[PDB]
Homo-oligomer: A and B are copies of this chain.
Amino acid sequence: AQSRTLLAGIVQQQQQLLDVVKRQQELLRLTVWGTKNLQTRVTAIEKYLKDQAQLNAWGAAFRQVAHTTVPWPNASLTPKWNNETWQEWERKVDFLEENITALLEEAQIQQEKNMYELQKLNS
């Protein structure tokens, strides 16, 4: 009178949820890659912004043998506020990412055992 057939569905449902959760983890990494990759583009953009500051007034003088160059910063470089927080942001993802992988490894081991134990009841 045991409802093993129902348990087989429940145990299987956990496996499907586990697969999606695992997929979310891989997908989550991609989101981090795009967000983080954009930051690399931003650093490249900051350089170009600075190059402009170099452009100020060239040839702006026909009676003087001099050129005035005023490289006033143009890129707001983030050294402490965002860089320090960004490192924390990436670090945190690492700790949670590692936590998730650890839990997934346990879930996979445990998910298999629940299915293995079920087979024994009706092997």
Q: Is A76 at the interface (CB under 8 A from chain B)?
A: yes
Assuming the A-B contacts A9-B113, A48-B76, A96-B27, are A61 and B62 also in contact, with contact meaning beta carbons closer than 8 angstroms in the complex? yes
Nearest CB of B to A15, in Å = 9
Asked whether, in the complex, the Cβ of A31 is within 8 Å of the Cβ of B33, the reply is no
The count of chain A contact residues (Cβ–Cβ below 8 Å) is 79
| Inter-subunit contact A103/B16 (CB<8 Å) | yes
Residues of A57-95 contacting chain B, CB below 8 A:
57-63, 68, 72, 74-76, 78, 82, 85-86, 89, 92-93
Residue contact B11 to A14, C-beta cutoff 8 Å:
no
Complex interface: chain B residues within 8 A of A7 (CB): 3, 6, 10
Q: A30's contact among B5, B23, B93, B117, by CB below 8 Å, is which?
A: B93
A1 vs B88: C-alpha distance in the bound complex, in angstroms? 52
Query: For residues 14 through 51 of chain A, which have their beta carbon under 8 Å from a beta carbon of chain B?
Result: 14, 16-21, 23-28, 30-39, 41-42, 44-45, 48-49, 51
7 contacts across the A-B interface (CB closer than 8 A):
A9-B114, A16-B103, A23-B96, A27-B28, A32-B34, A34-B35, A57-B58
